Amino acid sequence: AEFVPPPECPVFEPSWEEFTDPLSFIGRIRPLAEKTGICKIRPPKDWQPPFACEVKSFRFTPRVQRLNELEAMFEQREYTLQSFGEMADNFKSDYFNMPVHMVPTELVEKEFWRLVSSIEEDVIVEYGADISSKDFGSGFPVKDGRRKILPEEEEYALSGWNLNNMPVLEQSKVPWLYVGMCFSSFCWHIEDHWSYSINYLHWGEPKTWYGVPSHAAEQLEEVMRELAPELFESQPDLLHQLVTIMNPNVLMEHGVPVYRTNQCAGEFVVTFPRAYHSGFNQGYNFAEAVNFCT
Numbered sequence: 001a002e003f004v005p006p007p008e009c010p011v012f013e014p015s016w017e018e019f020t021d022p023l024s025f026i027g028r029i030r031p032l033a034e035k036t037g038i039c040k041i042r043p044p045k046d047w048q049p050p051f052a053c054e055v056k057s058f059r060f061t062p063r064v065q066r067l068n069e070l071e072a073m074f075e076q077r078e079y080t081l082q083s084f085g086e087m088a089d090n091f092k093s094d095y096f097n098m099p100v101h102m103v104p105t106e107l108v109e110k111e112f113w114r115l116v117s118s119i120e121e122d123v124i125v126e127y128g129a130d131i132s133s134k135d136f137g138s139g140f141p142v143k144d145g146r147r148k149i150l151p152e153e154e155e156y157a158l159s160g161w162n163l164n165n166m167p168v169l170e171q172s173k174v175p176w177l178y179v180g181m182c183f184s185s186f187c188w189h190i191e192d193h194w195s196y197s198i199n200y201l202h203w204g205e206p207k208t209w210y211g212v213p214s215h216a217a218e219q220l221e222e223v224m225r226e227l228a229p230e231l232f233e234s235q236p237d238l239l240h241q242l243v244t245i246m247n248p249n250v251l252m253e254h255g256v257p258v259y260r261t262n263q264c265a266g267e268f269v270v271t272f273p274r275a276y277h278s279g280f281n282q283g284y285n286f287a288e289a290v291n292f293c294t
């Protein structure tokens with residue numbers, strides 16, 4: 001039948017007192033959030049960092065994504081932020097025959113998973129994924145000198161929730177940028193070294209997430225290995241994770257607990273250690289993410 005949305009993951013709305021430092025806050029929500037794999041954090045209403053990327057010079061060549069590439073078993077355009085947004089909005093409004101902001105998030109979700117398994121329709125999108133923040137700057141203001149920081153921006157340049165200020169060292173990395181369009185996606189994966197990840201949506205349409213708690217990681221990997229094609233089943237996990245696309249209902253039918261969320265502009269998503277996650281974008285948006293350890 002049609003897609004059944006997984007239950008919603010926890011959403012936290014901390015006060016200014018609880019919003020003091022992300023490390024301590026993540027530590028306190030851990031008893032609940034680690035049981036759901038992912039969680040969403042809404043900052044206080046007055047916490048609004050200004051977008052600090054060099055929009056004039058922001059040029060990139062996104063990667064081509066064919067939604068049904070696994071069910072089928074020549075694709076190779078430079079955009080600006082503006083020209084990519086025009087292409088993205090035109091694609092979505094043309095696909096759904098309605099203004100982009102009027103398409104329900106549930107409809108994009110059900111259509112995405114239908115297209116992923118559809119053998120009759122071949123939908124192709126583009127994703128500006130894994131763009132280094134060293135190339136055109138971070139979405140957050142930073143004390144760098146390459147871009148002037150206004151007095152109203154210094155608070156955000158020094159904020160602990162600025163992803164450039166996260167601790168990224170283990171015991172013995174820069175944020176990445178993601179320019180999304182409708183149906184652009186990332187498949188199921190965990191982070192290197194089982195690290196945390198934190199993801200901020202600077203602006204645009206929501207990013208839809210799916211998460212699995214770490215206690216079900218082995219269960220997910222066994223389901224993924226049982227249903228993956230024989231050519232990819234024996235591949236190392238770092239390589240298999242490039243094509244690990246799977247409908248969440250298939251995991252839920254095999255007893256895997258899965259949670260979902262729509263990450264809206266200005267909201268954080270935190271993934272916990274060894275919490276498998278995947279998702280897709282509802283439309284033209286801009287996200288920034290970094291891995292960190294506690």
Ligand SMILES: O=C(O)c1ccnc2cc(-c3nc4ccccc4n3CCN3CCCCC3)sc12
Nearest residue numbers: 129130176178185186187189199207242287289
């Ligand atoms: O799209 C989001 O918003 C999002 C949210 C959470 N996790 C992820 C992971 C993503 C991803 N797609 C890939 C396609 C090919 C190869 C690697 C890919 N990777 C991980 C990239 N990884 C290693 C290289 C440097 C950057 C970090 S996209 C994404």
Ligand SMILES: [Mn+2]
Nearest residue numbers: 189190191197
């Ligand atoms: Mn990730």
